[PDB]
Amino acid sequence: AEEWYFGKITRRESERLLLNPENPRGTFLVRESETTKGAYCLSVSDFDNAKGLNVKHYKIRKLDSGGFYITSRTQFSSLQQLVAYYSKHADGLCHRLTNVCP
């Protein structure tokens, strides 16, 4: 029911969705590996004058002790905590997460 979770959408279909010019910087979605349940990626739209509209994909790593992270220095207890956090602060990303991908 998470507006931003798109299940097993492929990398290519996720870029086609996110690359739409009406998506503001930071539009994003979370997707899952097709084979590995629980293995997630955060796909996000961005823009700069070098690459123009582009999509960045971050593997959402899992610690053995449980937990999720896209950069090891910032650990979360769940996907919702992580998405909530980067929606408030870029904290290293080029831009904070904004619109859930439509």
Binding site: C41, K56, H57, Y58, I70, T71
Partner: peptide, 7 residues
């Protein structure tokens, strides 16, 4: 292909 990363 490729997976972004940041410090």
């Amino acid at each position: 292909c490729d997976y972004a990363n940041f410090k």
